[PDB]
């Protein structure tokens, strides 16, 4: 029983991309990321709470965090539901990677359909940077591009 979703990422920058998501029943969610125009290196990549882009990517609110935990790495016990970690942009400015995660389902109470994905200006310090913002945003800086998670045919 596969369900599928997609986010088209755009912003007030030259960064663009498409992210596809799929899930069987209540299993983990598979996320295929392809984003262009990125500065080579690490970029924070998160599922934010709201699929609201009225005033740009800041309208999407904070990292999706139904458990009221602090910011961490995807592999950590302590993390936000939306904490997908970093993606790596290559020398052509392309990040292309498939991630699998268990806190961003497409069905049920914590469904991320209608929320938003956001790619960030800076590396996500995973809560370990010892910076003022480490424990909330990973100090990932600005929101280069974002898109609402929408349903797509199976």
By a kind-dependent CB cut-off of 5 to 8 A, residue 3 interacts, out of a second copy, Zn ion, Cu ion, none, with: none
Phi, psi of 5 (to 5 degrees): -145, 170
**Identified catalytic residue from 63, 101, 124, 125:** 63
By a kind-dependent CB cut-off of 5 to 8 A, residue 118 interacts, out of Cu ion, a second copy, Zn ion, none, with: Cu ion
- The site map against Zn ion for 37-66 (x = CB under 5 A) is --------------------------x---
> Where in 58-117 is the site for a second copy (CB under 8 A)?
59, 61, 113-116
- The site map against Zn ion for 78-97 (x = CB under 5 A) is --x--x--------------
Phi, psi of 149 (to 5 degrees): -75, 115
Calculate the CA dihedral of residues 94, 113, 99, 56 and round it to 10 degrees. 30
Q: Is 120 in the site for Zn ion (CB under 5 A)?
A: no
Q: Is 71 a catalytic residue?
A: yes
- Give alpha helix (H) positions in 1-154: 134-137
Calculate the CA dihedral of residues 86, 90, 94, 95 and round it to 10 degrees. -20
> 22 or 86, CB closer to a second copy?
22
Phi, psi of 49 (to 5 degrees): -65, -40
Mark the binding-site residues for Cu cation, compressed into ranges.
46, 48, 63, 120
């Amino acid at each position: 029983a596969t369900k599928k979703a997609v986010a088209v990422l755009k912003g007030n920058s030259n960064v663009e991309g498409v992210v596809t998501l799929s899930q069987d029943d209540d299993g983990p969610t598979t996320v295929n990321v392809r984003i262009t125009g990125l500065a080579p290196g690490l970029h924070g990549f998160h599922l934010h709470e709201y699929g609201d882009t009225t005033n740009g990517c800041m309208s999407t609110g904070a990292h999706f965090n139904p458990n009221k935990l602090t910011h961490g790495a995807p592999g950590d016990e302590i993390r936000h539901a939306g904490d997908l970690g970093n993606i790596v942009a290559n020398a052509d400015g392309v990040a292309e990677v498939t991630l699998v995660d268990n806190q961003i389902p497409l069905t049920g109470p914590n469904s991320v359909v209608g929320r938003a994905l956001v790619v960030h200006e800076l590396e996500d310090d995973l809560g370990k940077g010892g910076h003022e913002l480490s424990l909330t945003t990973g100090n990932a800086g600005g929101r280069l591009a974002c898109g609402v998670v929408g349903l797509t045919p199976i």
